Amino acid sequence: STGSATTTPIDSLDDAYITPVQIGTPAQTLNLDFDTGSSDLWVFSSETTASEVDGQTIYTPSKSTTAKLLSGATWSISYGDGSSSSGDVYTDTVSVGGLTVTGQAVESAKKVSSSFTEDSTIDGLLGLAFSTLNTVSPTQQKTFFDNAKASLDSPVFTADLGYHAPGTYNFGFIDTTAYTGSITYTAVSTKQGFWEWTSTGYAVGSGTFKSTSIDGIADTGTTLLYLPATVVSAYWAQVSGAKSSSSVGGYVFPCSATLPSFTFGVGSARIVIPGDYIDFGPISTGSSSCFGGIQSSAGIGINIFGDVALKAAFVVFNGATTPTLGFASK
Ligand SMILES: O=C(NC[C@H]1CCCO1)NC1CCCC1
Numbered sequence: 001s002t003g004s005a006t007t008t009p010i011d012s013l014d015d016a017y018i019t020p021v022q023i024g025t026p027a028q029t030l031n032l033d034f035d036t037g038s039s040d041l042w043v044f045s046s047e048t049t050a051s052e053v054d055g056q057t058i059y060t061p062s063k064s065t066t067a068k069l070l071s072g073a074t075w076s077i078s079y080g081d082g083s084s085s086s087g088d089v090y091t092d093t094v095s096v097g098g099l100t101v102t103g104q105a106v107e108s109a110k111k112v113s114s115s116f117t118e119d120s121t122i123d124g125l126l127g128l129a130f131s132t133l134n135t136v137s138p139t140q141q142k143t144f145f146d147n148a149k150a151s152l153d154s155p156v157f158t159a160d161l162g163y164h165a166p167g168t169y170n171f172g173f174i175d176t177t178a179y180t181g182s183i184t185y186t187a188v189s190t191k192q193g194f195w196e197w198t199s200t201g202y203a204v205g206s207g208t209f210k211s212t213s214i215d216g217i218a219d220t221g222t223t224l225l226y227l228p229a230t231v232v233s234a235y236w237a238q239v240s241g242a243k244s245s246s247s248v249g250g251y252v253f254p255c256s257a258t259l260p261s262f263t264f265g266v267g268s269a270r271i272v273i274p275g276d277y278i279d280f281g282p283i284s285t286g287s288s289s290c291f292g293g294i295q296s297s298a299g300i301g302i303n304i305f306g307d308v309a310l311k312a313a314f315v316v317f318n319g320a321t322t323p324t325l326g327f328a329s330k
């Protein structure tokens with residue numbers, strides 16, 4: 001089997017991407033955040049504290065004839081941005097882009113933190129990291145991909161995120177028309193539960209490539225590119241007037257600037273992030289200070305190749321017995 005679904009930016013900045021997901025019978029379609037840095041499929045629901053729902057579409061398990069309460073199971077997750085959610089668990093039928101999993105754990109939120117409430121466009125998360133990170137207790141549950149992968153034509157999914165435009169998540173096949181050149185594959189460590197890999201270096205604009213190992217994860221659920229402070233300083237030094245602002249929380253730059261590209265290495269291959277992809281717009285409405293899309297990882301403990309990086313590539317998440325990542329230009 002295969003599946004293919006369009007993923008759409010939630011706003012004009014590509015702050016996140018939402019993908020429609022069918023849950024239950026009859027289907028209830030929710031727009032989820034496909035997240036390769038976590039492993040829980042959770043949704044706003046009829047069980048979510050009413051004051052914490054503000055415009056999201058909810059899953060109502062009592063209206064799904066295939067929903068079954070997973071007796072005694074609870075979940076609770078906290079993310080690297082400080083957000084969180086928790087609740088109970090159903091199993092139900094879940095379909096993405098025509099690919100169907102029966103008995104998928106659907107984690108129903110009883111509580112969500114304010115950032116989730118305040119974002120009416122994200123109805124929940126669909127985790128695509130390794131199932132070792134799933135938070136369901138006392139019986140850990142499998143991700144949608146883990147449940148589907150034996151049925152897939154090939155045990156892979158691909159992320160093709162758009163810049164200020166829709167893109168595609170495919171399951172079970174590699175669309176050879178969706179990229180240019182070749183896909184370069186690189187080793188993955190699953191020891192922390194992420195799609196963790198080692199970039200071979202970077203360049204800023206037209207500058208020389210610096211060969212240096214940068215261990216990080218491929219995270220569709222992280223918006224920006226988080227790299228070591230040395231690398232980030234080297235980038236922003238090429239933008240006149242850019243500076244790290246403790247009050248704002250990262251590097252900012254004059255909105256009048258033209259940003260240079262940023263290149264990262266995948267083996268001997270090179271992925272070029274155009275400068276425009278690094279502009280996250282005014283820090284507050286009407287400001288001429290703009291927020292940068294490349295930020296230091298020093299305070300996170302791990303480098304993150306988030307959407308800023310991934311959207312410059314066609315990315316293969318190869319879930320073979322020994323997982324690997326693939327990157328192609330597009
Ligand atoms: O939490 C992370 N990103 C943001 C969350 C919010 C909802 C989806 O993703 N990234 C983690 C990756 C490893 C360290 C932090």
Ligand SMILES: O=C(NC[C@H]1CCCO1)NC1CCCC1
Binds near residue numbers: 122304
């Ligand atoms: O990218 C991050 N959050 C993504 C937003 C979009 C929708 C959900 O939240 N958070 C990063 C902060 C420092 C590492 C994780």
